[PDB]
């Protein structure tokens, strides 16, 4: 039997690259999505024509709410429903926008940036472990967590909380043989709405090649962490940042 993986926010960009690379290694995959129904279904179709019955979609909003635990339990349940097992959880889904200290309410911003980035990852981890061989969880972290961007405090808080979850769950789940690790991009695929001239300003700051990470380059690191080549690795966050985090002001 082939192993199964849940990837959150897997319809496009980095999430899709990870689901594709997992599927290419031989994983059956759950492609979780929020609004990107069209993109997600088309990915699933794509992968299913490669191998029949190896990809399903799963819709869920990961905003913090009182029914977030139910939603996260369901995401994991969908993997068991489809594939009778769940071996890998990748926490990739992320809300991302500024929340200046000095549109949406603050209660919504906390709910979205903390829920999707930290609370849903925590709840998914609970459901993944409670439902339970190379078992592991990989969290998409931020290489730049300790050199935060101006006006992004809630996002930064959620990514910091994600590091704590990675480390706490690695420690707590190690007795059950579940590894928990992180992949920390610096700059990878830039926001869709960003202009080119702004994109280059940011690219030029990367010491290694003055370019952003490709989605595949990020995916390669997730693949390593789930493989038998990382069997003793738990609680590690691998930066994939071409040295961005080492560059002073």
């Amino acid at each position: 039997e082939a192993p199964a993986a849940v990837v959150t926010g897997a319809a496009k960009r980095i999430g899709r690259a990870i689901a594709v690379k997992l599927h290419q290694t031989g994983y059956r995959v759950v492609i979780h999505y929020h609004n990107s129904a069209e993109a997600a279904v088309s990915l699933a179709d794509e992968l299913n024509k490669e191998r029949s019955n190896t990809a399903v979609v799963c819709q869920a909003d990961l905003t913090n709410s009182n029914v977030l635990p139910a939603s996260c339990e369901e995401i994991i349940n969908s993997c068991f429903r489809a594939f009778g097992r769940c071996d890998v959880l990748v926490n990739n889904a992320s809300a991302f926008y500024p929340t200046p200290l000095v549109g949406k309410t603050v209660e919504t911003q906390v709910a979205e940036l903390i829920g999707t980035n930290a609370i849903a990852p925590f709840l998914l981890t609970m459901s993944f472990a409670q439902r339970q061989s190379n078992l592991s969880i990989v969290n998409l972290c931020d290489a730049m967590v300790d050199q935060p961007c101006m006006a992004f405090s809630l996002y930064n808080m959620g990514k910091h909380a994600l590091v704590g979850l990675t480390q706490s769950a690695a420690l707590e789940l190690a007795p059950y043989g579940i590894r928990v690790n992180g992949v920390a991009p610096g700059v990878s695929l830039l926001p869709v709405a960003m202009g080119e001239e702004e994109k280059d300003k940011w690219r030029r700051k990367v010491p290694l090649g003055r370019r952003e990470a490709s989605a595949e380059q990020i995916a390669d690191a997730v693949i390593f962490l789930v493989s038998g080549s990382a069997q003793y690795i738990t609680g590690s966050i691998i930066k994939v940042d071409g040295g961005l985090s080492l560059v002073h002001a």
Copy 2:
């Protein structure tokens, strides 16, 4: 006039010592409480008997909700109402208990462990800065953040979040001359819930004197950070842990 300080969770233990010490240095103080009304009023009385009209109490329940933004606004407001200024915010209020990955509802667990530990400090920081000399904020961090205790993931996530806030807010509020720093205790006042045979097992682990920090040792570090002796210091987290975080397994 005398500068004014807000200390959250100021009725007992560490918050009390901070409020007492700020007051001895010459601050006017807001003693915030949620449950401990009697103890907060008792403190204010002792501080006022020392210097008239220098200590007031403020009630606010710091558990994450749609009304947490209002509670946090109120706390900052009560300082400006009492003293006509707010120079110092000490984010000291803290919920603390386990949340095993494998009682309260998890919605309540998140409200308290992320709500009061990280979201309230964010909202208090916003309101402090919105309302604005030696201005600073001091956050009660955890020196053991990167060596988390088993089954304490939500606690640990909120304290990780707090580091993110400290660093993000330090950066974003610097242009206002607002400094944002942390004090990170190791072992503090051991739970009266705990016994004594157990209490020493945790005590003997501290390299410096095999004892816990007093609340006043913690407060000393807060006093330093708010003083004119730390006017170039922002984004720094001072461990007051007697060497604890440095001890390997």
Copy 3:
């Protein structure tokens, strides 16, 4: 033609496993050693049986002195004379013993613990870079911020190696030379160490209650030098079973 790797302290233990896995990946290998000539030679022979003229040995002491720069220049040179190229440098060699703050002279302890752990890696990095998927992998310590009692000079050396890893990543990036670290927690324990003591350390490891095999450490090194890690530089991968996350 196949790429070429230099592995310091390659005769035994972690160094041997890395040299083997590199060789198995298709690398030609320079096997550096200090005192383990028999093990370094018999490793070269075994590898050369597998693929002819793919392994050589190179002797050098990595202690700090006025001749260390020449010794490190010669290690790098040997890879070029053997194989006509040098694509990978693994800084693995390590002196390891306690240096309490309160019968080697202290200046010898500095020479050995700082020279081999930090200074020799720096000089090798210099020679490697001047001579040019190029990368360097330094063997760091996952426990670098939770130091053992009475290992200050060892701990200083390993902390300095983090500095080197990050400084050289930044400085060599314009040449497309990546520089990374692999940080073990507990790996191969002294074979002389009593089993009962061996078990006190293993039990502290959350993942599996055992030390890392040499091969598991090597796997991280293989990942970092591969095409799967081409955007990775200045990164230090812990291979510690969660050890560094365990409080007192």
Copy 4:
């Protein structure tokens, strides 16, 4: 009886401001120097005019050699000879200059940058402890140690080794009640050789006030760490960097 302090590289700049403040706090001081003979003697005079018999000078080259241990033992001996005691060691002396990977030999560069920045602090710590109340050591670290400057690898290596020393000695010297801590500046007093346009380029990067730390601001943090207000603090490195280490590329 007054306590006694050793400050290395105390003739000028930050070491001098540290000696001056220790002296103002009540300490007797050993003013160590290498080359700055006139300045060191000039400081001891200033200090002795203020309180007679409270300052001495001590010459030593702190470059790594087989006599470096004898020189470090001598610096510590000098304090005991003048004052009968030695309560505080400040490791401040530092060689600083680029050592690119691609007029000094590499031997001398290693000997100076590693010797002064790391080995000499190790040997002074050793001699200090061996010769043995509120005893402590303060090491002058670097806030930017994980964000290195291009071509400063050996200097950065020495500063990294200094962190390991700080933490290692904190653990090892705790049972003797000797605390070991660090002060980590970002930019303070800029190089003499440096031109003014360059100075303002670097100055402009500091979020808190767009200026470098004064020597006195660095000394304030050292004073806190040696004081009774830091008795439970060991193994801690306080940044005094105005937020510099928090700024992304």
